[PDB]
């Protein structure tokens, strides 16, 4: 695609999220860069308004799959880059097992040289002393995720589903079921993929000099499941 040529080098990234979970309003700003050649993302997120009402690890998937490394033989399956620069809408429902749900709507596109992810997140039905509002999740991401992608030809887009598992402080796990839909914003041709998945590996850390509430993410994502 024309779009894939925008990703041959290191690209600056901005992320902006506005959130409301059970009426608790918050906002996140992120900055970093992506290097799709190696499937590599480095991002730092800062909580900028109301006290973060949910654990940082529950926002990782919401807070740019256009930075996935598609092997050469799988390049015809890369919807995400093909929709650039005009971008795509990415929507999800994230169902937290025995707890509430997030509904997210994001637009991912270039603004000049910079790849931007603008997100609205709405969470409802969360339990007051559950793992999310109770802040009972460990600050880590100890489980890899396979993001299973299929074409959605009717909307000239894709759908995905996957499970993420977040460690609870007692040693147990909080499951998050994700259903995802992406559709192009622009009128250029896009790539409709064969079934495949993104193998996604994330690591969270803290900047020791940062006193604001924040999250540092290092993430490697590789398309797979086609030989
Ligand atoms: Mg209700």
Swiss-Prot record:
PTM comment: Contains a chromophore consisting of modified amino acid residues. Maturation of the chromophore requires nothing other than molecular oxygen.
Effect of residue 101 to T: In EBFP1.2; shifts the excitation and emission spectra to shorter wavelengths and increases quantum yields compared to BFP
Effect of residue 64 to L: In EYFP; leads to yellow fluorescence, folds faster and more efficiently at 37 degrees Celsius and has superior solubility and brightness
Cysteine pairings via disulfide bonds: none
Superkingdom as given in the UniProt entry: Eukaryota
Uses, biotech or industry: Green fluorescent protein has been engineered to produce a vast number of variously colored mutants, fusion proteins, and biosensors. Further generation of mutants led to more stable proteins (at 37 degrees Celsius for example) with brighter fluorescence and longer fluorescence lifetimes.
Effect of residue 195 to S: In EBFP1.2; shifts the excitation and emission spectra to shorter wavelengths and increases quantum yields compared to BFP
InterPro entries: GFP, GFP-related, Green_fluorescent_prot
GO term, biological process aspect, one: generation of precursor metabolites and energy
This protein's UniProt keywords: Chromophore, Luminescence, Photoprotein
Outcome when changing residue 65 to M: In Citrinine; leads to excitation and emission peaks of 516 and 529 nm, respectively
Tissue expression from the record: Photocytes.
Subunit record text: Monomer.
Family (UniProt): Belongs to the GFP family.
Known role: Energy-transfer acceptor. Its role is to transduce the blue chemiluminescence of the protein aequorin into green fluorescent light by energy transfer. Fluoresces in vivo upon receiving energy from the Ca(2+)-activated photoprotein aequorin.
The protein's name in its UniProt record: Green fluorescent protein
Species this chain originates from: Aequorea victoria (Water jellyfish)
């Amino acid at each position: 695609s024309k779009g894939e040529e925008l990703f041959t080098g290191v690209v600056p990234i901005l992320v902006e999220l506005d959130g409301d979970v059970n009426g608790h309003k918050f906002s996140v700003s992120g900055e970093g860069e992506g290097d799709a050649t190696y499937g590599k993302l480095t991002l730092k997120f800062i909580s900028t308004t109301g006290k973060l009402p949910v654990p940082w690890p529950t926002l990782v998937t919401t807070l740019v799959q256009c930075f996935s490394r598609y092997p050469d033989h799988m390049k015809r399956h890369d919807f995400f880059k093909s929709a650039m620069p005009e971008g795509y809408v990415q929507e999800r429902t994230i169902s937290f097992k025995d707890d509430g749900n997030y509904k997210t709507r994001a637009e991912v596109k270039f603004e000049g040289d910079t790849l931007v992810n603008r997100i609205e997140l709405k969470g409802i039905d969360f339990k007051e002393d559950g793992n999310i509002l109770g802040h009972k999740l460990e600050y880590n991401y100890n489980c890899r995720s396979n993001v299973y992608i299929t074409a959605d030809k009717q909307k000239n887009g894709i759908k995905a589903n996957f499970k993420t598992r977040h460690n609870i402080e007692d040693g147990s796990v909080q499951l998050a079921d994700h259903y995802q839909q992406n559709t192009p914003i622009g009128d250029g041709p896009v790539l409709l993929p064969d079934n495949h998945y993104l193998s996604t590996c994330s690591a969270l850390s803290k900047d020791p000099n940062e006193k604001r509430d924040h999250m540092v993410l290092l993430e490697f994502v590789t398309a797979a499941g086609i030989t």
